[PDB]
Symmetry: C2
């Protein structure tokens, strides 16, 4: 009498959502609208309808040790910050090791997920799915939604009077792939998220002049941290977490801001914003400062008005003979197949722990990977998936509707106090906070106080070292044999791919 | 009556050597073998015989405020680290301001410069020159040699057994221009001078894999120094100079090395050499560490042997399916037109203050810009030129042959004690030491002790601020009226091109 779980999407979130089903003995059916896995990380030269488009050169901004699945370490020889193709290969490896591919039926789009007539007792969903033009209806005991949130382009043309008049080319970051078409041209980038940044430096290699236009400015991080350790291996350690907690937000901020200014002074470089370090989604770009100091990227304020030829800026300055404008203005999400269960408006959604609709008579619809962490999504989707599948079996249970809604509203409230008021700051999470939060719900949070005495060597690494995901496969339901071994050898794996010449 | 001076070459050194002549009332004839000025900084898509070839993307590693001519500051809006095109434009500006172009005859190569029969009394040179096939002979009262030293490729194929056997492409850095010739290829770079570095990162943008092969390793700097000030504006300040002098070499070294390790640990990154920071010509690359941590540049030891397909490395590791090898193995210099007078063998020459042959009955042959400074060459060539033209008249005089040769030998000796034993470390200079040394001989060293009392505001900048070249146009022979004004506004010009977006 095995519960059948629909997993929608076969990216990082889909893949782990299948594994998490199999591991609690549920039968996963996985629908994936394209002809392969990886979702966002499977680069193609052309954009595809209804799946995340990326550019060829993209290198992931989260260290391999911090983004691995908890029970499947990334290979020793893989670099600390992997190219999009290496992320994809690792996903393929994950899917072979846990035999996930057979449960996927590709080329299959999910049109509709409606609670059934008997939902108040059965908790079951009517999933409708088209496949090369032929419909199909099925019933399921639970649904895990693993569609992305970097798919539907946010192209706010309405807030750029005279863009309709502009006679150069202009398009969303989505459609950017390589800089060939920009040799010796003058290009404006709108927005200073990681798309803005990546494109501003890349296009500046070929282009005559790139302008990086920001309406706010940005605090700007480097993945090459102190001593060349990955910045997230350093910042996301339980010790740094504890130091942050006693020191408070505004002092943490002053530390981080003063750190970033030592690298380059955001005021002198024209990038300094009115907000604080932790009030914005981190923009990571080690190359941007060096391009700015050479004039090949020019930091600008917001474009107020476009002509046939030019941009006018909020400060009355003007830039002429503009060949192309790219809107790195980011993405909005929605659920066309769930316009009954889950509602989103301008990236505002209400979900308990970012996962469960609170207004469900049964807890049988999980939303996986709908978070913007200061960290990797894959490891959080996995914990979301461990938890999700447990409440599908009734091994764990949700609070009452009204107390779910208090936590939801409490979260939206402090997120709104903390983060700059923009559509991209609606689902922010911190990495350690989030991993612990969901780990505690699954009962796999490592007992670090006991281990202090029962194993002082492990205990030390767990605390003073990086808060690696493998940490959450030590104890509890999904307990993994080789967690302790891998957790201790985490240094070796960070160094393996860098000691390619002997020094001694 | 007024002495005629042959200036050989019309790059940075030629251009300033003409101006230095005009300013001591001498008649310059300038022979340039090419059809234009700029020498090394005039990029063309094809390499040209007997003039420095560079790559399209080259950005100068010395700050604008540290490389300007002493009496012609670079415009406000020009960036702190200029692209090769902007260096060239600035030279064109210099040549307009001081009306130098009319004294150049282009397409004219100097074949021979021989001391004349009456040289022990007349001090005159037989300069022979071909111009579109037809020779021409002339006599001169002095010769300033401004041929470069980054023209004749050093391609040491003999020390790569099996390169004759290799079936991919291979060429010297000289012939490199763009990375698009390497898309999806596996490329090995020999050498980690600035060409090695530049190409290793550039080619890694298109290439499947780049390997950066060094037989030594290298200490590696960043142009974006503390708070995003140009590193040379910070390191080359009389104050830093004095701090260095009391602390000694080994302590200075430990400071610089510990500084570079904070950015990235040269041991972990596999770049750390057995020598010290100041024992090697500085390799500057802000972008290299980020490419190494992503695997797109792989640090290797020396190639011991090439096959049809592969490189074998000094540590017995092998890399297969290698499409292309670029020898960034640097340059040798020589004087084909001066074999009678000046002897150069594997970059070892004997010249008093790097300028004067010591064995000359008259001091009427100056060698301009034959130095490898921890700084800009242009400003040193200029001071060399001020001095040179003074000793051509009778304003200044050289020591006796015997005491010149003791100083020459003393210089070669301590240079050999300090620097790693290699062809490119035969003419190393320190910037401040060298500027002061030559300034003192011209009597234009600024009297900073006097100014302490005569002008404490200026005195402070001269000491605590950057040791800008304009400093040496304050007092003495060539005195410039607008020096003090520019020296004080030096911060403004560093910031002008970076505050392109409103802060307040
Ligand atoms: C340029 C860029 C860089 C990024 N870098 C990082 C990073 O460094 N670290 C990080 O943690 N995150 C990063 N992200 C965020 C990124 O989205 C996540 O890392 C990761 O892609 C999450 O994948 P997912 O499986 O949750 O969603 P996706 O990868 O988008 O997977 C969704 C899948 O569902 C399919 N699908 C869509 N609609 C349907 C439907 N109706 N029915 C069936 N299938 C459907 C899609 O075709 C796709 O295969 C980046 C995003 C971008 C755009
Ligand atoms: C990629 C690269 C980057 C560099 N970056 C820097 C830097 O950042 N800072 C720095 O200070 N230095 C740098 N250098 C060093 C460089 O040598 C100087 O910047 C500067 O260009 C030297 O100028 P020059 O006039 O001494 O030589 P060149 O510019 O080489 O001038 C030589 C001229 O003489 C002509 N010539 C040669 N032989 C004859 C002949 N027999 N008769 C007539 N004409 C002749 C040539 O055609 C040419 O016009 C760099 C070098 C390279 C290759
Ligand atoms: N691995 C990588 O290197 C990499 C590369 C690219 C992207 N990413 C990831 O991809 C995700 C989204 O990418 P993104 O950078 O395109 O998204 P983003 O962070 O939403 O970028 C949006 C940028 O555009 C600005 N903007 C938005 N609307 C605007 C308007 N109407 N007018 C003017 N300016 C406007 C934003 O300012 P506000 O602050 O006002 O919103 C912001 O600077 C992020 O999770 C990021 O981590 C990663
Ligand atoms: N503005 C810029 O960005 C820029 C760019 C490029 C060049 N430049 C300048 O132009 C000048 C030329 O520099 P470059 O990189 O062309 O040459 P370089 O400084 O002479 O360095 C050559 C490299 O090749 C190595 N090498 C030499 N012979 C070798 C051999 N037989 N086997 C293996 N390796 C060998 C050297 O090692 P050793 O240490 O053993 O000599 C060194 O690492 C330099 O002053 C540089 O600063 C500036
Ligand atoms: C430049 C000044 C360096 O300042 C540096 O700050 C970082 C905080 O991110 C600390 O760096 C690290 O230390 C601890 C101790 O092993 C680690 O658990 C943690 O990953 C990290 O925070 C350094 O201990 C401190 O010296
Ligand atoms: O059409 C979208 C764009 O694709 C690529 O990014 C090209 O470089 C660009 O020229 C083109 O306009
Ligand atoms: O933000 C206000 C306060 O928050 C925390 O309680 C800190 O311990 C304290 O030092 C800080 O001033």
């Amino acid at each position: 009498t095995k519960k059948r779980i629909a997993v929608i999407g076969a990216g990082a979130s889909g893949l782990t959502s299948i594994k998490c089903c199999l591991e609690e003995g549920l039968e996963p059916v996985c629908f994936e609208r394209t002809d392969d896995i990886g979702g966002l990380w499977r680069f193609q030269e052309n954009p595809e309808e209804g799946r995340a488009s990326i550019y060829k050169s993209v290198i992931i901004n989260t260290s391999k040790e911090m983004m691995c699945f908890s029970d499947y370490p990334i290979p020793d020889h893989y670099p600390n910050f992997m190219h999009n193709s290496q992320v994809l290969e690792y996903f393929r490896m994950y899917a072979k090791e846990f035999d996930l591919l057979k449960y996927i039926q590709f080329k299959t789009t999910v049109c509709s997920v409606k609670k059934q007539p008997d939902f108040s007792t059965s908790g079951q969903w009517e999933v409708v799915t088209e496949c090369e033009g032929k419909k199909e209806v099925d019933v399921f005991d639970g649904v895990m939604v693993c569609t992305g949130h970097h798919t539907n382009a946010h192209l706010p043309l309405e807030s750029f009077p005279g863009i309709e008049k502009f006679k150069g080319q202009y398009f969303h970051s989505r459609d950017y792939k390589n800089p060939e078409g920009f040799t010796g041209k003058r290009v404006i980038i709108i927005g200073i998220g990681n798309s803005g940044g990546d494109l501003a430096v890349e296009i500046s290699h070929t282009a005559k002049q790139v302008f990086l236009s920001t309406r706010r400015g940005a605090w700007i991080l480097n993945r090459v941290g102190d001593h060349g350790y990955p910045f997230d291996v350093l910042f996301s350690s339980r010790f740094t977490y504890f130091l942050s907690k006693i020191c408070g937000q505004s002092l943490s901020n002053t530390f981080l801001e003063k750190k970033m200014n030592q690298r380059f002074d955001h005021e002198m470089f024209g990038l300094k914003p009115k907000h604080r370090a932790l009030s914005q989604h981190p923009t990571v770009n080690d190359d941007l400062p060096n391009r700015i100091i050479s004039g090949l990227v020019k930091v600008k304020g917001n474009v107020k008005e476009f002509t046939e030829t030019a941009a006018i800026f909020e400060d009355g300055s003007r830039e002429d003979d503009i060949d192309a404008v790219i809107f790195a203005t980011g993405y909005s999400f929605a659920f066309p197949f769930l316009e009954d269960s889950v509602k989103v408006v301008k990236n505002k959604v209400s979900l308990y722990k970012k996962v469960f609709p609170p207004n469900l008579e049964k807890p049988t619809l999980a939303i996986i990977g709908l978070i913007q962490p200061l960290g990797a999504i894959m490891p959080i989707s996995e914990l979301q998936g461990r938890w999700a599948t447990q409440v599908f079996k009734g091994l764990k249970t949700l609070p009452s509707q009204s107390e779910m809604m208090a936590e939801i509203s409490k979260a939206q409230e402090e997120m709104a106090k903390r983060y700059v008021d923009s559509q991209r700051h609606t689902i922010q999470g911190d990495y350690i906070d989030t991993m612990e939060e969901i780990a505690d719900l699954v009962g796999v949070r490592p007992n670090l106080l006991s281990l202090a005495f029962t194993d002082p060597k492990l205990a030390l690494k767990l605390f003073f070292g990086p808060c690696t995901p493998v940490q959450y496969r030590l104890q509890g339901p999904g307990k993994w044999d080789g967690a302790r071994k891998t957790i201790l050898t985490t240094e070796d794996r960070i160094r393996k791919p860098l000691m390619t010449r002997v020094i001694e």
